[PDB]
Design an enzyme around this catalytic site. Structure first.
Site, mmCIF file in Angstrom:
data_model
loop_
_atom_site.group_PDB
_atom_site.id
_atom_site.type_symbol
_atom_site.label_atom_id
_atom_site.label_comp_id
_atom_site.label_asym_id
_atom_site.label_seq_id
_atom_site.Cartn_x
_atom_site.Cartn_y
_atom_site.Cartn_z
ATOM 1 N N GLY A 6 42.544 29.272 43.075
ATOM 2 C CA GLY A 6 41.447 29.110 42.145
ATOM 3 C C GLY A 6 40.069 29.058 42.767
ATOM 4 N N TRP A 17 38.490 31.563 44.067
ATOM 5 C CA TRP A 17 37.802 32.749 43.568
ATOM 6 C C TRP A 17 37.225 32.506 42.179
ATOM 7 C CZ3 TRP A 17 38.332 37.247 46.803
ATOM 8 C CH2 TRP A 17 39.226 37.080 47.866
ATOM 9 N N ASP A 23 47.788 34.130 36.874
ATOM 10 C CA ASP A 23 48.657 33.865 38.012
ATOM 11 C C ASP A 23 49.949 33.238 37.511
ATOM 12 O OD1 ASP A 23 49.726 33.514 40.557
ATOM 13 O OD2 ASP A 23 47.797 32.914 41.409
ATOM 14 N N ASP A 54 53.474 36.027 34.391
ATOM 15 C CA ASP A 54 53.542 37.110 35.359
ATOM 16 C C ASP A 54 52.242 37.907 35.340
ATOM 17 O OD1 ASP A 54 55.193 38.978 37.192
ATOM 18 O OD2 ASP A 54 54.546 40.333 35.591
ATOM 19 N N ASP A 57 43.746 38.718 44.338
ATOM 20 C CA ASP A 57 44.036 37.909 45.518
ATOM 21 C C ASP A 57 45.541 37.811 45.742
ATOM 22 O OD1 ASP A 57 43.628 36.408 47.757
ATOM 23 O OD2 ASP A 57 43.119 34.554 46.696
ATOM 24 N N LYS A 62 42.429 42.344 48.377
ATOM 25 C CA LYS A 62 42.769 42.162 49.781
ATOM 26 C C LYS A 62 43.954 43.046 50.150
ATOM 27 C CE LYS A 62 44.355 38.099 50.942
ATOM 28 N NZ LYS A 62 44.603 36.737 51.490
#
Lengths: 35, 114, 138, 415, 225, 365, 316
Positions: free
Chosen positions: G44, G46, G64, G80, G105, G145
Site C-alpha cells: 500500500g 504506492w 490486490d 484476484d 507492483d 516493475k
RNA sequence: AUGUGGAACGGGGUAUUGUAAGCAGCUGCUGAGAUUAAGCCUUUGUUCCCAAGAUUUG
RNA sequence: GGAAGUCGGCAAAAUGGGAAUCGAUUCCCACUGUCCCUAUCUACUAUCUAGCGAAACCACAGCCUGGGGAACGGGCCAGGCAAAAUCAGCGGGGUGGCUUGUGGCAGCCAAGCGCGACGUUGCUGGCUCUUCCUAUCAUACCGAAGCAGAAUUCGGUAAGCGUUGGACCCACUAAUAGGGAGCUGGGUUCCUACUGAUGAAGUGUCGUCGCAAUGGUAAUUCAACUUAGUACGAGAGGAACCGUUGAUUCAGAUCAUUGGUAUUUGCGGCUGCCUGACAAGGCAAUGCCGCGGAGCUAUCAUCUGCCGGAUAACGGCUGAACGCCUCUAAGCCAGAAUCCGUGCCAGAAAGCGACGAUU
C-alpha cells in the site's frame, strides 16, 4: 523403523534360530566334523 | 556372459574389463582398456593406428580368410535347442578349430618371413 | 507419494552426476528444450552435500528454454541419460554422451509421447510409463 | 463432501493447557537478573509471540477445516441448515475469527510495551499480563468451541453424497418397504426395525447397473427428519421412488399415502416417480395413476418379489430421462476355470510358493519348465565359454557332420 | 476380459507380452502375475517366466505373434537360449540388430498384418516379414509414432487413441482388415498397448480399468463366446 | 551457547585409540560358544592374502531386483596351505577368568615352528624343545599325566597349530603359530582329537566348506602418521578433551570384517580350480603373470567376497561366526560362472597365454 | 535500510513508495493522472504516495489479493487481480471515465529458480497490461516493475508496439543489487482492436529461432566436448539422420551436412549413388569414413571435403 | 654362522609405449624397438659373498 | 555438474565479452576445484645427523570435580587419582536455592480465623566446530478421542539416533525441536592438557602362546514385494504382524574393475639448440603434447555393520489392607530405539598364567 537392539527383532531372530533355518548349519558342521 | 570384441583394438573384452559407450544413435561401443577409450575420444582411426588388429587385417598383415572347418564362427541370431551330443561334439570342434587355426597361423607367418 | 511414487521396483545405487543447478536436455516431444534442476526427491540431511540425481531419479525441473505453456510449473522430471560413468550391477560401466530427461507428472506418466535418443534400462524399470513410451531402451 | 477430515476440537481447558504447555516446553525457561536488558526483553517477547502463534495456528485450523456454507453445493448447505442452523454455525465461526484477531492485537500491544522493560520483573508481569489476556479471550468462546465439536462429531457421521452422479431418491411413508427396497438394491446395511422412523437421517448407497453406478439416497419417512428428507429431494437430479403400502401392512393407509404423495408432488416434479405397491405379499390410487409418471410396480415385501424388477425399471427410466482364422485350442473350449474351492482345479505356482516358504524364500526354478528330451538334465549347466570362444556360436544340430567333412580335409593336407 | 495387476502397477502390457501361441511374464517380482496367467492359459499355450537383457519390460521390449518372436540387440545369449528352450519347436525366435531397441513400442503385430514405426530400418522390416510372415506397413497412429504402445492388435479386433479422427479410424481399419475402435484403457490412460494385452480368445487389462472400458474391449474382441 | 549447525561425529569412538596394533597376526578375541551336543570340530584357520580378483556368478536371490541375473563381484584370494597341529592347551574357568593350566607339545617340531621362538635362527644353537623331545622319548607316562590333567580339570581345549609358510611363495621363513579352540564334545573328546591330530596337518577342506559365513580378522594397511584431514575425515575456556579429533597414526590397526562368504575352496593339487561349469578353459587361480607382489598360488586357496583388511602377503585369521545369522544372503548357495585371471599388473587383456596365442599372431620369439 | 528507516519515520509502508515518488518526480506523470488503477497494491505504499500527490477526488483504485488497508480515495478491492468479478467492479467504478495511468507492483514469492521468478511475474506483468490495455484511454500510461531476463527484451518489444514511448529506468531508492527495472509505457497506441497475437502469450514469448548453429567449428575440431544443451533438432525422433551421397556432392553446404548428419549412405537403388560407389575416386577408406561420420577426425573430414570437390570437378 | 642360503647381473613371463636405428626395397625385417621394479612373478643360468666383530645378560 | 561457495565470480579459466540501465549495476550466453568433494604430483621447510648456537620469560611451580562467604586459585578442605626417562605433533588452558503456565478493578458468597481461599458475575549476526540438558520435531512403545479404514489430534515413558539444500520466503525430508558450557561483515561521523611414538625396571634372564581388571563403543531412517485391492468401508478409499529385497545417513576397511593423478621423466610425437655432411644420438630452470604401468585415491570404485538380561510409561495374575473390591502393600507375568552386559577397539607400560631354552 525399529533397530537391531529391538527386543522384537531379537525375538523373531531367536525364532529363526529355533527352527530348521539353523539346521542347515548343523548338518553343515557335521559334514566337516565327520570327514 | 559374452566375451565381446572391442571397437578399437578388435581384441577380447571380458566382463568387468573396459568401458561401454552409448551414442545418441543408440549405437553401443565397447572399449577394452583406457588406452582404446581415450584414443576413441581423440578419434584416431583404427585403420591408421598401428597396434590395432583392425589395421593389421585391413593392411594385409593378417589372413584374408580362414574357412577353418567349413565354419569358424558367427553371431547366430537364431538360438538352438540344447542337446548334449551337440554340446559335447561342439566342445570338441572348439579345440579342432584351435589347432587348425594355430597351424595356419604358423604357416602364414612362415610364408611372410620370406 | 512422489518419493518413490509409482516406482514398481527398487533402484540400485548409481553414481550421481547431475547435482542441482544442472542444465540438461529435454528428451520428449512435448515441446520443451532445456531443463534446470531445482531439487531432487529423496535427499536426506547431509551437511554441505549438494543434492544430486542419477538415471531414473525424479527431480524438480524448470524449463529454461521451451514452450511457454509448458513452463511456470515446477514439474517433476525423470533423468533418463547421464554423462557421468556409472557401474551397472552386472559389472559393465555405462555412460551416455549427454544428460537427458523427460517432463513427467508427480504420478509418473509424462506429458510427452515419444523419446528421442537412448533410454537407460534403470530409468525404464522404475518408470514403466517411460519404458512404454520409449523408442530405444539401452 | 467428505466431512471427516476436521481435526477434533478440545474444550477450553485442554486448549489452554496444550497451548501453555507447548509455550513452556518449546521456549527457553531460565533467565537471571544480571543479564543484559535486551536479552531479558527478548526472552519474554519470545514467549508472548510464541503463545500468540500457537493460538492462531490452532484457531486457523478450525476456521479452514470447517466447510464454508456459501461455497458448497446447496444440497449440503440446506442439509446443514436443517441440522445446524447456519446462523448459529456462522456466528460460532465468526466468534473464533474475532477471537483470533483479538489474540493478535493483545500480543502486538504487549510486545510493543516490552521494548521499554527496565527490570526483570516489569517484563515478567507484562508476559503474565499478556498470557492472562490471551487466556481470558479464549475462555469466552466456551460455548462456541463446545458447539463446533458437537457439530464436528455429527458431521463425521454424515454420508458422503455426490449429486453430480446419477441418483434415485427413495422417499415415502415410514417403514413402508422403502428400507427393504434399498437394502435389496444396494449393499448398504439399512437397519429395519418395528419402531417408526428408524432411518433418522439419510442413507446413501451405491448400486452398479447398466455399466454405471447410481447413488440411491433413502430419505426419512413421512419434524427435523421430514425437513431433511424434503431438502434431500429439493436439489437433486434424480427420480422419486415412492412406496405405497398396497395391503397397508406397514401401518399407513393407502389413501393417506396417496394424499401425502399428491401434496409432495410439488417438490417431486421433474422426476419419474414410481407407484410401488409395497407389501403385496403381505379410488384414491386412480388420481395418482392419472399422473402417468409413476410406475405401478407390485412390491411383494413379505415375499421379496418384484424388488429387482422395480429397481431395473427405475434405472431404465432414470437413464432414459438423463483370412483371420482364430485357431483357439480345443483345450480352451473345455478348460475348467481356476476356482480355488473345487478339487479338480490344478495347482498354480502361487500355491507351490505358500507351501515352499512364501514370498521371498521360495526359489522358482526357471529351468523347471523347459521343453526338453529329459527331465533329469533339467538342472544342468550349459558351458558358455571355452578357450576364448563361446560355446553358443557353435551349437548346431548337424555340427557332427561338419566335423567329419573337416576330418577328411585335414587328412588331405597332412598327406 | 480379465483384470490383473503386476505387483501394484496398472500397466501389465509393459511387464508382459501375450500372443496366440505363448505367454511371456516378467521374472523376479511376484509370480502372482504368473499365477494369474497360468490360471487362464496354462492348459492352452506355454507360459515363459522370462526376462530380456536382465529387464522386466519384456512386453514392450519384445514383439511377436502366434508364429514368431523377436528380441532386441540387448538380449543376452543366456536369456535367448532360455527362451528357445522354453518355447516349443514350431515357434521361431530371432534377434534384431535394430537401432530402435523397443520392439514392443515400434511394432504392433497380429498373426497376419503388422503396422510399424515409420522410421524403421529396411533390414528390420525385411526380417520382420521373414520371421513374422505378416504384411508390414509403415504408418503412425493418431500422429504418434509408437504404434505398439499406442495400439493393441488381435485377430478379430483392435483399439487406438480416443484422439484419432473418424477418417483416420476408417483408414486404419481399411489398412488392417480388422475392426478398430477408438478407446482408452486403465481409466483414461491413452497407452492402450501398455494397459492391454490380448490374444485371439482372451484379454487382460489392468485392475483400474473401468467397467465401461472392459465392455468396450469385450465388444470389439467378441470374447463373450 | 548451543551449536547452531549440527552434524554427526566425524569419527567412531568405538575404534579409538588409533594406535599401532601390538601384533602383526590377527588375534581372535572371541571364539564361538561351545556345546557338548555337537562333538569335536575346529573353529578357525590361518591364511595369507595373496591377491584379489573379480568373478561373475548367477545370483539366485529370491525377491531381489536382480534375481537370476549375472552379477560381477570382487573377490579376495587367500592361500591356505594345511597347518600342522603341534600342541594342546587346557584352559580352566576361574572366578578371575580363563587361565591356561598346562600345555602339551608334540615330539617332532619342524624348523618352521622352531624359527618362531628365535629372533635369529642361524646364530642360535637350536636347543629349544630338545629336552622335551628327550623326555617324550623316554617316558610317555608323564605326557599322559598332563593330558589326564587337561581332560580332568580344564574346561576349554585349544590346539597350537602353525602354518606351513614354506609352502607359500613367501620370503618369510618363520611359521605363524596360534591357538584354535576345539569346539564341541566333551573335554575328553577334544583331548583325544588333539592327540590323534598331533604332528598331522589339518586343511581348509576340513575346516570350511565353501558356503558358510566367516569372520576375517587382521591388521590393516599402514598409512603412517596423518593429520586430522584423512585420519578423522575433518572438513568456552576449557582443556582439550579426548573426543576432539587430533592428528596421529592412521592405519595398522587390528580390525574385524564380519560376514564374509567363501565363494570357493580350491585345491592346489587340482589344475581346474579356476575353471567353472560355465567356463571349462583349464586354468589356475593365479592370474596371468603371477599375483602382483605375492607370487604364484600352488596350495589350497579360499575366495571370499569383498575386501579383507591388510595388504597382500599379510596373515589373516578366518574364524567361524560366533552367532548364527540366517540372512538369505548367508544361506543361499553360490554357483560360479567365470573367474578373472587376467594380468593385474597393468591393463591385462588375456586370461591365459594359451588363449592369447591364437588371437595374437606368430610372435618372432 | 536507509529507505526502510525513512518509510517508518515518515509513515510510508514500503521503500517502493519512495521508488514511486522519485519516479513521479523525474517523469511527472501521476499529478495529471485523473484515473489511476494500481494492481498488486501490497503493501500500500504506492497507494499512499498516489493519494497524497494526486488532487483529492480522483479515480484511485487499488486491487490486490491481500486485505488492502483502505487508502484515502482509493477504492480497495480484495480479490484476484484479474478476476471476472474484480474487472466488473473496475468497470463499475470506471463508468464514463477511462483508465489514465495503471500502476502495477507485481511481486511473486521468491525462493525458487531465478528464471521461474523472473518469468513468473513476466506473465503477471503481461497479464496486468492485458487488463490495462482493456481499460486504458488513448495516450495513457502503464508503469510497473520487471526483473531482467531473456524475456525482458520481448516484453519491451510488445510494449513498443502497444505504446508510443517507453521510458524504463531505475530509481535510486530501488535496491541496485536486485535486477528490478521500472518500465514506463506512455502514449497508449489505442488500437482499433486488441491484437490476438499480443493477447495470447504463445505468440508473445515464442522462442525466436537463431541463425545456423556454429557446427563447422565442431567439424574442424571433432574433440572439445562443449556440453550441447539446446534441445533435440526440433522434434527429431531418430538422431541417426542420413544424407544422400549424390545430394551431399551436389549440395552447397558441406560443412553443415557433416556437422548435422551422422552418416552419408550410398544407396544401391539410386543409380547416381551407385555410380559414385563404383567411381575409382571413392576408395574403401573414404567409404568406411562416410559410413560412420560422427567417429571421424579432422584429417578424415578434410579428405572427405577434398573428395567431394574432386567429384564436383568430374561432373562439371 | 654352508644352506630347497643370500646378493649382483642374465634369460623368460607379464606389462607401458607404438612398429625403432640400421639394412634396405609407404612396404619388409617389424605388434618391432626401448623400458619392466625401483614396494611385478619365476629361475638346474653365470658370477660373487657368508661357519664374523662388538656390547648386555644367573 | 558449473558460482549451487561467499556479504560477493576473492583468486584462477574462457582471450575475459555480448546486450541493456545509471566506471558501477543487471541480464543472457561462455569459462573454470569457489563448491558438491576432495584426490594426486613436484620443490622447499619441518624430521634425523656433523659443526656452530641464541633470546623473550622466569617467587616457586605444575592433573580434574565440589567447596573455600569474595576473586575462586595452584598452594587450603573433602574426593577421583598417582610410577622413571623421553620423541614428534597440535595449541585448549595464562554476583537471590533467582528462574518457568495461567492480566488489572469491583461485587456476591464464605471452609474458617474486619479479613477471608477456590469459585461466581460484571469491561478495553553468520562461517564452520566438541560435549551436555529435556523442557521430544522425527524414529520406538503406550493411553485417551466419531478412533470404521487410511490419515490425524492430545497426553505418558523416552535424549539411543537424526534434526538439510537455496534466494521470513520454496523445496526436500521421517523431521528439518528448544537451549547451556578458530573467523568476518555491515552498523553511529615454558609447563599441563589432547593425539600418536618409544622406553629402564622387579616377577632369576630372554623369548613364544595366552588370560582380562578397566576404559571406549555404533549403527540410523526410509520404501518395495507379497500378506492386498484382502480386514474395514454403500461407496470413495484401504492398513497391519511374520517373511523378503533395496536405498538415506553414519562407521570400519579394500584397490579386482572404472575414473583421476604423472618424476617410471617409461615410450612416442612437435619446436628450437649442439658435431661438415647420410645418419647417429644428446640438450632445453619438468620446452610443449598424447598415452602412461606401480602407488595413492574417489558414497567418482567395492565390501562389511550382532544378541542376552533388567526395567520406565503401560496392560494384567493372585491377594490383603477394609469379611466386598483392588495391578501392590508381600510376590508374579508381559512390556520402549531405554539401562546393563555379549560383540567390537585398547591392554594395567607397578595385573597375571602356561610353555621353551638356560651360558
Amino acid at each position: 523403523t525399529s533397530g537391531p537392539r529391538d527386543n522384537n527383532r531379537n525375538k523373531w531372530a531367536k525364532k529363526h534360530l529355533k527352527k530348521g533355518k539353523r539346521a542347515k548349519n548343523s548338518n553343515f558342521s557335521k559334514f566337516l566334523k565327520k570327514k | 556372459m559374452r566375451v565381446h570384441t572391442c571397437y578399437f583394438c578388435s581384441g577380447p573384452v571380458y566382463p568387468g574389463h573396459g568401458i561401454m559407450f552409448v551414442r545418441n544413435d543408440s549405437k553401443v561401443f565397447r572399449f577394452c582398456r583406457s588406452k582404446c577409450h581415450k584414443n576413441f575420444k581423440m578419434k584416431r582411426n583404427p585403420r591408421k593406428v598401428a597396434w590395432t588388429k583392425a589395421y593389421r587385417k585391413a593392411h594385409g598383415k593378417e589372413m584374408v580368410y580362414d574357412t577353418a572347418l567349413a565354419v569358424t564362427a558367427a553371431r547366430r541370431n537364431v538360438p538352438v535347442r540344447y542337446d548334449r551330443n551337440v554340446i559335447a561334439t561342439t566342445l570338441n570342434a572348439m579345440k579342432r578349430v584351435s589347432q587348425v587355426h594355430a597351424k595356419r597361423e604358423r604357416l602364414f607367418y612362415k610364408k611372410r618371413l620370406a | 507419494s512422489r518419493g518413490r511414487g509409482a516406482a514398481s521396483g527398487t533402484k540400485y545405487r548409481m553414481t550421481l552426476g547431475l547435482p542441482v543447478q544442472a542444465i540438461m536436455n529435454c528428451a520428449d516431444n512435448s515441446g520443451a528444450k532445456n531443463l534446470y534442476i531445482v531439487s531432487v526427491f529423496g535427499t536426506g540431511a547431509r551437511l554441505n552435500r549438494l543434492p544430486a540425481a542419477s538415471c531414473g531419479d525424479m527431480v524438480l525441473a524448470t524449463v529454461k528454454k521451451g514452450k511457454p505453456d509448458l513452463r511456470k510449473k515446477i514439474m517433476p522430471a525423470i533423468v533418463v541419460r547421464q554423462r557421468k560413468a556409472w557401474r551397472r550391477k552386472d559389472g559393465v560401466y555405462l555412460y551416455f554422451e549427454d544428460n537427458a530427461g523427460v517432463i513427467v507428472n508427480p504420478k509418473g506418466e509424462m506429458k510427452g509421447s515419444a523419446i528421442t535418443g537412448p533410454v537407460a534400462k534403470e530409468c525404464a524399470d522404475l518408470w514403466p510409463r517411460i519404458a512404454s513410451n520409449a523408442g530405444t531402451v539401452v | 463432501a467428505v466431512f471427516k477430515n476436521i481435526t477434533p476440537i478440545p474444550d477450553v481447558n485442554t486448549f489452554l493447557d496444550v497451548v501453555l504447555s507447548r509455550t513452556q516446553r518449546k521456549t527457553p525457561t531460565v533467565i537471571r537478573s544480571g543479564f543484559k536488558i535486551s536479552r531479558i526483553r527478548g526472552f519474554y517477547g519470545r514467549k508472548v509471540k510464541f503463545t500468540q502463534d500457537t493460538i492462531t495456528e490452532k484457531l486457523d485450523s478450525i476456521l479452514q477445516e470447517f466447510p464454508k456454507l456459501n461455497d458448497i453445493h446447496p444440497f449440503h448447505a440446506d442439509l446443514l441448515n436443517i441440522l445446524y442452523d447456519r446462523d448459529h454455525l456462522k456466528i460460532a465461526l465468526s466468534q473464533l475469527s474475532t477471537a483470533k484477531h483479538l489474540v493478535e492485537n493483545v500480543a502486538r500491544d504487549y510486545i510493543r510495551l516490552l521494548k521499554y522493560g527496565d527490570s526483570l520483573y516489569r517484563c515478567k508481569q507484562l508476559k503474565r499480563a499478556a498470557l492472562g489476556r490471551m487466556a481470558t479471550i479464549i475462555k469466552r468462546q466456551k460455548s462456541s468451541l463446545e458447539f463446533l465439536e458437537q457439530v464436528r462429531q455429527h458431521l463425521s457421521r454424515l454420508p458422503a453424497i455426490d449429486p453430480n452422479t446419477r441418483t434415485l431418491l427413495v422417499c415415502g411413508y415410514p417403514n413402508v418397504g422403502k428400507s427393504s427396497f434399498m437394502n435389496k438394491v444396494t449393499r448398504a446395511q439399512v437397519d429395519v426395525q418395528p419402531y417408526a422412523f428408524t432411518t433418522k437421517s439419510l442413507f446413501v448407497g451405491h448400486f452398479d447397473y447398466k455399466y454405471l453406478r447410481w447413488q440411491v439416497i433413502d430419505t426419512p419417512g413421512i419434524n427435523t427428519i421430514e425437513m431433511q428428507s424434503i431438502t434431500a429431494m429439493a436439489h437433486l437430479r434424480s427420480a422419486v421412488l415412492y412406496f405405497m403400502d398396497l395391503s397397508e401392512m406397514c401401518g399407513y393407509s393407502v389413501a393417506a399415502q396417496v394424499k401425502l404423495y399428491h401434496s409432495i408432488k410439488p417438490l417431486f416434479a421433474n422426476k419419474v416417480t414410481i407407484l410401488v405397491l409395497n407389501k403385496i405379499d403381505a379410488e384414491l390410487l386412480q388420481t395418482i395413476i392419472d399422473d402417468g409418471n409413476v410406475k405401478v410396480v407390485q412390491t411383494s415385501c413379505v415375499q421379496d418379489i418384484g424388488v429387482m424388477d422395480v429397481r431395473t425399471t427405475a434405472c431404465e427410466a432414470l437413464l432414459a430421462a438423463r483370412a483371420r482364422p482364430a485357431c483357439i485350442p480345443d483345450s480352451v473350449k473345455t478348460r475348467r476355470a481356476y476356482d480355488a474351492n473345487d478339487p479338480n482345479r490344478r495347482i498354480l505356482a502361487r500355491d507351490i510358493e505358500a507351501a515352499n516358504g512364501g514370498a521371498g524364500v521360495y526359489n522358482v526354478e526357471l529351468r523347471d519348465k523347459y521343453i526338453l528330451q529329459d527331465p533329469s538334465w533339467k538342472y544342468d549347466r550349459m558351458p558358455e565359454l571355452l578357450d576364448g570362444k563361446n560355446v553358443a556360436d557353435f551349437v548346431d544340430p548337424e555340427i557332427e557332420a561338419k566335423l567329419l567333412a573337416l576330418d577328411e580335409e585335414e587328412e588331405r593336407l597332412e598327406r | 476380459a480379465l483384470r490383473a495387476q503386476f505387483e501394484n502397477s496398472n500397466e501389465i502390457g509393459v511387464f508382459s507380452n501375450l500372443t496366440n501361441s505363448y505367454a511371456l511374464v516378467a521374472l523376479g517380482g511376484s509370480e502372482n502375475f504368473y499365477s494369474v496367467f497360468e490360471a487362464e492359459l496354462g492348459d492352452v499355450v506355454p507360459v515363459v517366466h522370462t526376462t530380456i537383457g536382465g529387464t522386466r519390460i519384456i512386453g514392450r521390449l519384445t514383439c511377436g505373434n502366434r508364429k514368431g518372436l523377436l528380441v532386441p540387440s540387448s538380449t543376452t545369449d543366456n536369456e535367448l537360449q532360455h527362451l528357445r528352450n522354453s518355447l516349443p519347436d514350431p515357434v521361431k525366435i530371432q534377434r534384431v540388430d535394430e537401432r530402435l531397441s523397443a520392439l514392443g513400442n515400434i511394432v504392433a503385430c497380429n498373426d497376419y498384418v503388422a503396422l510399424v514405426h515409420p522410421d524403421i530400418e529396411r533390414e528390420t522390416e525385411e526380417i520382420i516379414a521373414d520371421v513374422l510372415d505378416v504384411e508390414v506397413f509403415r504408418q503412425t497412429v493418431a500422429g504418434n509414432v509408437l504404434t505398439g504402445s499406442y495400439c493393441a492388435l488381435s485377430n478379430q479386433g483392435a483399439l487406438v487413441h480416443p484422439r484419432t479422427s473418424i477418417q483416420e479410424q476408417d483408414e486404419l481399419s481399411s489398412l488392417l482388415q480388422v475392426p478398430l475402435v477408438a478407446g482408452t484403457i486403465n481409466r483414461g490412460s491413452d497407452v492402450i498397448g501398455a494397459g492391454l494385452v490380448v490374444n485371439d480368445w482372451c484379454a487382460f487389462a489392468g485392475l483400474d480399468t473401468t467397467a465401461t472400458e472392459l465392455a468396450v474391449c469385450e465388444s470389439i474382441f467378441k470374447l463373450q463366446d | 551457547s548451543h551449536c547452531k549447525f549440527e552434524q554427526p561425529r566425524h569419527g567412531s569412538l568405538g575404534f579409538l585409540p588409533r594406535k599401532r596394533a601390538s601384533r602383526q597376526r590377527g588375534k581372535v578375541k572371541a571364539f564361538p560358544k561351545d556345546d557338548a551336543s555337537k562333538p569335536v570340530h575346529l573353529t578357525a584357520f590361518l591364511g595369507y592374502k595373496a591377491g584379489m580378483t573379480h568373478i561373475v556368478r548367477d545370483l539366485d536371490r529370491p525377491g531381489s531386483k536382480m534375481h537370476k541375473r549375472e552379477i560381477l563381484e570382487a573377490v579376495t584370494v587367500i592361500e591356505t596351505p594345511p597347518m600342522v597341529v603341534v600342541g594342546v592347551v587346557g584352559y580352566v574357568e576361574t572366578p578371575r577368568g580363563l587361565r591356561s593350566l598346562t600345555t602339551v607339545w608334540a615330539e617332532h617340531l619342524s624348523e618352521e615352528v622352531k624359527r618362531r621362538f628365535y629372533k635369529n635362527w642361524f646364530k642360535s644353537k637350536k636347543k629349544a624343545f630338545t629336552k622335551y623331545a628327550k623326555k617324550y622319548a623316554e617316558s610317555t607316562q608323564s605326557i599322559n599325566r598332563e593330558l589326564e590333567r587337561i581332560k580332568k580339570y580344564c574346561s576349554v581345549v585349544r590346539v597350537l597349530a602353525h602354518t606351513q609358510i614354506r609352502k607359500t611363495p613367501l620370503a618369510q621363513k618363520k611359521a605363524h603359530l596360534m591357538e584354535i579352540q576345539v569346539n564341541g564334545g566333551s573335554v575328553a573328546d577334544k583331548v583325544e582329537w588333539a592327540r590323534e591330530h598331533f604332528e598331522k596337518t589339518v586343511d581348509i577342506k576340513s575346516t570350511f566348506e565353501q558356503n558358510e559365513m566367516i569372520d576375517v580378522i587382521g591388521v590393516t594397511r599402514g598409512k603412517g602418521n596423518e593429520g586430522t584431514t584423512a585420519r578423522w575425515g575433518t572438513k568456552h575456556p576449557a582443556n582439550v578433551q579426548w573426543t576432539v579429533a587430533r592428528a596421529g597414526n592412521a592405519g595398522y590397526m587390528h580390525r574385524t570384517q564380519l560376514n564374509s562368504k567363501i565363494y570357493r575352496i580350491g585345491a592346489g593339487d587340482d589344475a581346474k580350480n579356476a575353471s567353472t561349469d560355465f567356463d571349462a578353459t583349464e586354468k589356475r587361480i593365479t592370474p596371468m603373470g603371477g599375483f602382483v607382489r605375492y607370487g604364484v598360488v600352488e596350495n589350497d586357496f579360499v575366495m571370499l567376497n569383498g575386501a579383507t583388511p591388510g595388504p597382500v602377503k599379510r596373515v589373516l585369521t578366518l574364524r567361524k561366526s560366533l552367532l548364527t545369522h540366517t540372512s538369505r544372503k548367508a544361506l543361499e548357495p553360490v554357483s560360479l560362472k567365470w573367474i578373472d585371471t587376467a594380468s593385474k599388473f597393468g591393463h591385462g587383456r588375456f586370461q591365459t597365454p594359451a588363449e592369447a596365442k591364437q588371437f595374437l599372431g606368430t610372435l618372432k620369439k | 535500510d536507509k529507505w526502510y528507516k525513512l518509510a517508518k519515520e515518515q509513515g510510508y509502508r514500503s521503500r517502493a513508495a519512495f521508488k514511486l515518488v522519485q519516479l513521479n518526480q523525474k517523469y511527472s506523470f501521476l499529478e495529471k493522472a485523473k484515473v489511476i488503477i494500481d494492481l498488486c497494491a501490497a503493501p500500500g505504499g504506492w497507494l499512499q504516495v498516489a493519494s497524497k500527490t494526486c488532487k483529492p477526488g480522483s479515480l484511485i483504485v487499488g486491487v490486490d489479493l491481500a486485505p488492502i488497508k483502505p487508502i484515502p480515495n482509493c477504492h480497495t478491492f480484495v480479490e484476484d487481480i484479474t478476476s471476472d468479478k474484480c474487472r466488473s467492479q473496475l468497470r463499475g467504478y470506471l463508468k464514463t471515465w477511462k483508465a489514465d495511468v495503471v500502476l502495477h507492483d507485481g511481486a511473486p514469492n521468491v525462493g525458487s529458480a531465478w528464471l521461474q521468478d523472473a518469468y513468473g511475474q513476466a506473465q503477471l506483468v503481461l497479464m496486468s497490461m492485458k487488463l490495462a490495455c482493456e481499460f486504458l484511454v488513448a495516450g495513457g500510461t502503464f508503469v510497473t516493475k520487471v526483473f531482467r531476463s531473456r524475456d525482458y527484451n520481448n516484453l519491451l518489444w510488445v510494449f513498443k508496439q502497444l505504446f508510443n514511448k517507453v521510458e524504463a529506468t531505475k530509481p535510486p531508492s530501488s535496491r541496485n543489487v536486485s535486477a528490478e527495472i521500472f518500465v514506463v509505457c506512455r502514449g497508449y497506441k489505442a488500437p482499433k482492436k486488441l491484437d490476438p497475437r499480443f493477447t495470447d502469450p504463445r505468440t508473445v514469448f515464442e522462442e525466436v529461432q537463431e541463425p545456423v548453429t556454429n557446427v563447422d567449428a565442431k567439424v574442424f575440431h571433432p574433440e572439445k566436448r562443449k556440453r550441447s544443451r539446446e534441445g533435440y533438432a526440433d522434434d527429431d525422433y531418430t538422431l541417426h539422420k542420413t544424407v544422400l551421397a549424390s545430394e551431399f556432392v551436389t549440395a552447397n553446404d558441406p560443412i553443415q551436412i557433416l556437422g548435422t548428419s551422422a552418416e552419408i549412405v550410398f544407396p544401391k537403388d539410386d543409380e547416381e549413388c551407385q555410380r559414385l560407389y563404383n567411381l575409382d575416386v571413392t576408395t574403401e577408406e573414404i567409404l568406411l569414413c562416410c559410413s560412420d561420420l560422427q567417429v571421424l577426425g579432422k584429417k578424415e573430414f578434410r579428405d572427405i571435403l577434398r573428395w567431394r570437390l574432386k567429384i564436383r570437378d568430374e561432373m562439371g
